[PDB]
Design a binder for this molecule. Structure first.
Ligand code: ADP
Lengths: 533, 103
């Protein structure tokens, strides 16, 4: 109608799409440009003009939460708190919501995941239902995409229905426009603690499913990734790089031509073989055309992008490649300067490799039109980012991820003050330590964490003493000081004994002994002044 | 999920009469029937909660009884049903009456 036309010309994406659907060129192009338009920043990074991210989340009678409201950052949000505060519950809530986008990008009227009647409803909820309400943002044309997941407890007074239509509507735009002309698609992924799992050596050979673009959405929100799928896909990429498809077409074309000449020469026995070869040729051309039709990055380029990402983000890995050993393809890595198989990697290295490899694979598959596919859009959830990492890696991990995936919204959980030392306080959302489930707002810490000392973050943000209070030796310096002050600053028998204990335990060069020495010096001087007076 | 009246029609015309289903069901009914107004029960639960260590097991039993009573109260005419204790007794008598050499 005229109203839709005005709103669409004003830059409203839904109105433009509705006009496209009813008339089914200009409206199509508007929708496509809204999704595809972007610019390169001063750092050489592509930036979409219309960003997509989760802006707000509200939880009502969900697990431990009677009511919780969270505002999220466009780039990075870190949730911190003690064990059992509901950090994982928050990520699960988001993941379920994202499942509705994924389902509807894949299939019209696809269903995402529902809240559990048994586990997701708060135990003492008066209303005996749970709500997960989320609001998404997609550029100035679509400032609010509200979604609500609802579930009623088993006894059932009344049905509380979920409201998912806006998710479906938005996902429909992506699906339909992509069908007509290939567009870049958003990546959604959850990496929970299940990512820590043993590697199976037995690589199933390429049946064909891993090369399909929408395999990138397969089990994206299941928690583990699919590192097995990566390995299969990567070996596949390698084999295709060693063997060109057009030469096979040219060779097949030559074979078909030779067989056609034989059939024309009176050998009717080879007609069956000719028909088979013509079929094979047509299939090869179709695959080539589909590959051509998909407007896709070359297999060589795809391989290179992923390899670079892995080597840049994973500190111990300097190189990754496929070897033909014996009669079976093996992925090898240069780890800590030595060539090893994936099965030889430490659990920390493997788990982190798995995360990055999986994410990179999906981004390459979903962003074929970008020069750097890792600059695509998406929302990635990571539980316990520090899992299996030494402190030295914890100091690098957030920096590396954000550098490799500059346009992803990361929502992460951590217990690590070392991680927090690399992050701005605005990105941090902290639970109150004494929270008995009746807290409306998660809040930022008062101290600036980025560039701060770890000991300070322990005490000021994580509410933990820098020294273990249930060790006696931790109190000796305090006790020593008190004894010195009780005896007008002179080392008495008791203070000397404790001094010797401190010396014996911590050592001659210890900070503790130096502090004790300092106390002696200062107190002696103070006493001398007092006597002069 | 709790048992519901029209579950009686589930797999009635193929899949019925399997021994494992019986045993599971029977043990379940026994556990529930091992050990009555809602307001009175609500009052008893409240009194027991105020007392609450040795009475904690009794409180949990009474809370369960209260929840069941509320559920039965809330449940519809179309799903209205005999007590688990009665159901158990009828089935036991049926088995012993019908099956050769089981007393
Ligand atoms: N349905 C529920 N009702 C009440 N409390 C629950 C429910 N489900 C979980 N909890 C509580 O919530 C906590 C689990 O939250 P979780 O997200 O695993 O914690 P975190 O990620 O901070 O370690 C535990 O303290 C548990 O007792």
């Amino acid at each position: 109608t005229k109203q839709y036309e005005r709103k669409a010309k004003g830059g409203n994406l839904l109105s433009a799409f509705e006009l496209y659907q009813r008339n089914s060129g200009e409206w199509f192009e508007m929708c496509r440009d809204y999704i595809q338009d972007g610019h390169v920043d001063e750092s050489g990074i592509f930036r979409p003009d219309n960003a997509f991210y989760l802006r707000r989340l509200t939880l009502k009678d969900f697990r431990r939460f009677s009511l919780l409201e969270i505002k999220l950052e466009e780039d990075l949000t870190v949730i911190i708190g003690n064990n059992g505060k509901g950090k994982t519950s928050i990520l699960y809530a988001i993941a379920k919501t994202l499942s509705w986008f994924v389902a509807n990008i894949l299939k019209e009227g696809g269903s995402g995941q529902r809240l559990s009647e048994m586990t997701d409803i708060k135990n003492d909820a008066e209303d005996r239902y749970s709500d997960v309400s989320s609001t998404f943002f997609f550029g100035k044309g679509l400032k609010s995409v509200p979604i609500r997941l609802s579930r009623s407890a088993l006894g059932t007074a009344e049905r509380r229905d979920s409201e998912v239509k806006p998710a479906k509507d938005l996902a429909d735009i992506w699906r339909v426009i992509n069908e007509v002309n290939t567009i870049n698609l958003p990546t959604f992924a959850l990496y929970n603690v299940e990512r820590s799992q043993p590697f199976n050596r037995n690589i199933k050979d390429n049946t064909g499913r891993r090369e399909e673009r929408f395999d990138a959405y397969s089990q994206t929100l299941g928690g583990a990734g699919r590192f097995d799928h990566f390995v299969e896909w990567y070996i596949y990429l390698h084999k295709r790089t060693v063997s060109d498809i057009s030469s096979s077409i040219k060779e097949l074309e030559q074979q078909v031509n030779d067989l056609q000449r034989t059939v024309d020469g009176g050998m009717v026995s080879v007609k069956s073989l000719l028909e088979q070869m013509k079929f094979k040729l047509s299939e090869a051309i179709e695959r080539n055309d589909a590959a051509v039709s998909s407007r896709v990055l070359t297999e060589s380029v795809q391989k290179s992008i992923v390899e670079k990402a892995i080597c840049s983000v994973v500190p111990s890995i300097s190189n990754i490649w496929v070897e033909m050993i014996t009669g079976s393809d093996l992925v090898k890595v240069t780890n800590d300067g030595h060539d090893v198989t994936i099965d030889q990697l430490s659990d920390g290295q493997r788990v982190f490799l798995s995360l990055v490899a999986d994410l990179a694979r999906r981004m390459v598959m979903l962003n074929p039109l970008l020069e750097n596919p890792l600059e695509g859009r998406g929302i990635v959830l990571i539980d316990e980012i520090e899992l299996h990492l030494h402190p030295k890696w914890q100091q690098e991990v957030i920096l590396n991820l954000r550098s490799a995936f500059p346009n992803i919204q990361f929502i992460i959980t951590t217990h690590s003050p070392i991680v927090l030392s690399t992050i701005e306080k605005r990105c941090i959302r902290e639970f109150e330590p004494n929270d008995d489930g009746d807290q409306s707002f998660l809040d930022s810490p008062d101290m600036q964490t980025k560039g701060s000392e770890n000991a300070q973050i322990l005490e000021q943000v994580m509410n933990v003493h820098s020294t273990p209070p249930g060790i006696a030796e931790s109190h000796w310096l305090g006790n020593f000081e008190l004894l010195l002050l009780d005896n007008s600053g002179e080392l008495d028998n008791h203070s000397q004994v404790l001094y010797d204990q401190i010396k014996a335990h911590f050592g001659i060069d210890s900070i503790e002994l130096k502090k004790a020495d300092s106390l002696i010096r200062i107190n002696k001087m103070k006493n001398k002044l007092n006597k002069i007076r």
